């Protein structure tokens, strides 16, 4: 079986990630009583370029048969939540759109889309906005995350 771990992710500004819809995630600060709403990811180690600073991963939602993916939509790299066949996932060789390059930078994590280099899993500085794929060089949007094991 493919090597995986159960974890939560919080952005640089400590916002939690929640399942706002059947195929959507949102980021917002969660008070001590609403913490349980945060999504638990099952992060798998897929095939690709091995490095202590950059490793290929797939981000699934624990026991939900949902994976994050990046696809081109109207010429724009777009983050999606896709339902998968429970009998075929997780697998070592994932379809290219599911692969993220996990980067360890300044005691934080960045998730670069493997097929869209320079595009990262991002959050808005504002509250309760969807999690998206961002390509901005360094400004308004957050691309840095902390990981907490489950």
């Amino acid at each position: 079986p493919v090597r995986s771990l159960n974890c939560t992710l919080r952005d640089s500004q400590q916002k939690s990630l929640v399942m706002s819809g059947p195929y959507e995630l949102k980021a917002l600060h969660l008070q001590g009583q609403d913490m349980e709403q945060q999504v638990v990811f099952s992060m798998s180690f897929v095939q690709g370029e091995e490095s202590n600073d950059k490793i290929p991963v797939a981000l699934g939602l624990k026991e939900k048969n949902l994976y994050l993916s990046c696809v081109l939509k109207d010429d724009k790299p777009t983050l999606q939540l896709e339902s998968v066949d429970p009998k075929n996932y997780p697998k070592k060789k994932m379809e290219k759109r599911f692969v993220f390059n996990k980067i360890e930078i300044n005691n934080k994590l960045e998730f670069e889309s493997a097929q869209f280099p320079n595009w990262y899993i991002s959050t808005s500085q504002a509250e309760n906005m969807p999690v998206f794929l961002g390509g901005t060089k360094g400004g308004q949007d957050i691309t840095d995350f902390t990981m907490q094991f489950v």
Epitope: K73, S83, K93, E95, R97, F116
Partner: antibody, heavy 120, light 108 residues
């Protein structure tokens, strides 16, 4: 603009290895997201996906013949090769190469194809 | 493997007819479907991608629809040059699989 062209030996004996080449121009296979696939069509039958290779060398194969296939790229010659070992009369077909950018693949440009007959 | 099926193997239709070609996936393919046209003595051409997006250079009489498992390629007003075999392809899961193809003949 973009062109793909298949070449190969035309006639091969059963149990031999078949080597096919996809010569391409008008794009670089080292460009992020770029891919080249091989598809075949036996006489009177439909299209069958065989193999694929991404810009980063990640190979994909159809399990119905994965053990017999090898796909490779040469970005210095702008060529994608397909090697099929232990061929049989079931491998007689027109072989095509096609390109895409990103997953899921939309095969935007296809070659004219190369006919391979497997016979003694 | 996701099985792709095209219930019509061959049919004939008249110039001007609204032609419908169906493709059914064995499981949810999340609109990751594309349509290809194969003409005699010519390289296969992409017509429609991501269920409904028209490939650049393809006439507007070609359109695509569907979701989940059921998909349709429509030719609004059939032309004599539309004689070809049409194949659907799923990109949801490896191995990528094609429909068996639908050969469309022109009635005259």
């Amino acid at each position: 603009q973009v062109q793909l062209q298949e070449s190969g030996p035309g006639l091969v004996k059963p149990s031999q290895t078949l080597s096919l080449t996809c010569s391409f121009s008008g794009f670089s296979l080292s460009t992020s997201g770029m891919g080249v696939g091989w598809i075949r069509q036996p006489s009177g039958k439909g299209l069958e996906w065989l193999a694929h290779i991404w810009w980063d060398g990640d190979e994909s194969y159809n399990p119905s013949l994965k053990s017999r296939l090898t796909i490779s790229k040469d970005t210095s010659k702008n060529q994608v090769s397909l090697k099929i070992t232990s061929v049989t009369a079931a491998d007689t077909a027109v072989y095509f190469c096609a390109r895409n950018r990103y997953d899921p693949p939309w095969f935007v440009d296809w070659g004219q194809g190369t006919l391979v007959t497997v016979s003694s | 493997d996701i099985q792709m099926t095209q219930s019509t193997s061959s049919l004939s239709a008249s110039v001007g007819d609204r032609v419908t070609i169906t493709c059914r996936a064995s499981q949810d393919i999340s609109n990751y479907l594309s349509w290809y046209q194969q003409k005699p003595g010519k390289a296969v051409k992409l017509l429609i991608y991501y269920t409904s997006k028209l490939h650049s250079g393809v006439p507007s009489r070609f359109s695509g629809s569907g979701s989940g498992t059921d998909y349709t390629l429509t030719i609004s007003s059939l032309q004599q040059e539309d004689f070809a075999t049409y194949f659907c392809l799923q990109g949801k899961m490896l191995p990528w699989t094609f429909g068996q193809g639908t050969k469309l003949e022109i009635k005259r």
